[PDB]
């Protein structure tokens with residue numbers, strides 16, 4: 001629906017796993033009344049990466065929800081090379097940077113508002129049998145001080161119709177410090193592993209992205225920064241199997257940390273559902289106010 005002729009590059013917002021996002025202005029009338037949008041593109045437009053990207057575009061086009069970033073369309077060069085994904089532009093950036101910038105103004109009730117919105121988005125994903133796999137505060141965008149949206153689906157996979165997990169081991173490597181143990185061991189991704197990584201997201205939120213307190217920093221301090229390469233993963237594995245966990249962030253109430261640790265259950269079936277998570281978070285929020 002979008003003509004590359006009319007996309008005006010303004011800035012690069014960020015570059016991730018094989019892709020980049022740019023702030024552009026769609027101005028077809030050339031009269032500077034066009035709207036600012038986000039444009040996602042691939043940087044090695046391989047045929048693998050391109051059909052992965054087309055599956056991602058279909059997934060996003062199929063999602064409609066207040067806490068999911070709005071798909072707007074696609075734009076492709078002459079022929080079908082240089083496929084680009086057009087999305088709404090959220091003006092406050094990732095939840096990670098936003099939380100780091102306004103940490104003295106954002107109180108715990110606000111953190112829980114964000115948490116509840118994240119779990120409603122994730123529950124919508126699950127009702128569509130989608131597994132996000134990559135959920136992290138860097139992937140959560142801020143539309144304004146009262147609304148956040150899950151903002152990238154480059155790793156989202158559709159569950160097989162006959163099973164509740166999806167096995168995928170991708171070249172290059174991903175956020176091991178957000179990954180469930182079964183995803184480190186057997187490359188199994190499921191709603192429950194998304195729940196584990198939501199627990200890590202909640203941890204993130206209550207650390208306010210303090211420098212010492214990132215999951216990579218805490219985990220590599222717990223396993224020792226002396227170790228190298230592949231062995232990192234191995235040690236992480238057993239750190240998780242001896243119930244080594246991320247610590248309670250400073251100032252976090254014990255019930256929020258208990259939600260965190262309950263999503264960090266080694267037993268995949270004993271992890272809470274996103275609807276129960278929203279329930280508990282909304283009732284804690286109600287209690288605080």
Ligand SMILES: Cc1cnc(Nc2ccc(C3CCN(C)CC3)c(F)c2)nc1Nc1ccc(F)c(NS(=O)(=O)C(C)(C)C)c1
Pocket residue numbers: 012013014015016017019020021038069087088089090091092093094138139141151152154
């Ligand atoms: C869809 C979308 C709609 N709007 C915005 N708005 C937006 C506004 C402001 C800033 C920053 C503020 C100031 N700094 C310095 C520069 C920009 C911003 F980064 C984004 N972003 C979007 N996607 C996006 C963009 C960039 C990213 F890195 C990520 N991360 S990502 O998912 O992991 C991955 C890299 C895609 C794998 C996602």
